[PDB]
Amino acid sequence: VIAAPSMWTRPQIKDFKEKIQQDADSVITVGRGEVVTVRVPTHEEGSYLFWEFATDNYDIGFGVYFEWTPLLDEIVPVYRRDCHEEVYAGSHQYPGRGVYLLKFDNSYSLWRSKSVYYRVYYTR
Amino acid sequence: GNRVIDAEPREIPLEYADDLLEAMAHHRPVPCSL
């Protein structure tokens, strides 16, 4: 079937951001009421997905879906995360060949844009 | 209220290994569902 993911946190948020900042495409700017989907294909040489993310001043909705290759599976349901006080991270086991959809939901914010610091991984 | 980005999964750097030790030392599980 489909394996449950693990999700955790850690306090080194200023450290994390400084490493990520150095990369151009590892920092997204989600606008007012915006929803930025990040399509992360399964690596043919991989069996697990990992993710790290954070923001600077405000929270943001975050969840993860899985697209089979339009059949979807809700890996992590989209709820708001306090990724501005601690670094949010998690892992999940590939169920097959597909594309992970990392949702950064801001639809609920009428005035504030969110500066997302993120990075994705994989393990053999 | 929508935008799609494409990103390849990177590989865990060997440099950030001491970063995984502090993680496990401080990793505090959170619920996936609230």
A-chain residues near B14 (CB < 8 A):
none
Give the span between the Cα atoms of A2 and A104, in whole angstroms: 22
Q: Which residues pair with A32 in a beta bridge?
A: none
Residues of B within 8 A of A37 (CB-CB) are: 2-5
Phi, psi (degrees; rounded to nearest 5) at B28? -125, 105
Number of domains in chain A: 1
Question: Are A84 and A55 contacting, i.e. CB atoms less than 8 angstroms apart?
Answer: yes
Please check whether residue A101 is in contact with residue A66, taking contact to mean a CB–CB distance below 8 angstroms: yes
Judge whether A6 and A49 are in contact, CB under 8 Å. no
Dist. CA B14–CA A120, nearest whole Å: 15
Domain coverage including residue A64: 1-124
| Number of inter-chain CB pairs under 8 A, A vs B | 83
Burial code (b: 16+ CB inside 10 Å, e: under 16) for A57-74 equals eebbbbbbbbeeeeeeee
Residue A9's nearest CA partner among B27, B18, B17 is B27
Whether residue A124 contacts residue A47, with contact meaning beta carbons closer than 8 Å, is answered with yes
B9, B28, B31 ranked by CB distance to A120: nearest: B9
Structure determination method: X-ray
Resolution in angstroms comes to 3.0
Q: How far, in Å, are A44, A118, B32 from residue A53 at the CA level? A: 24, 4, 15
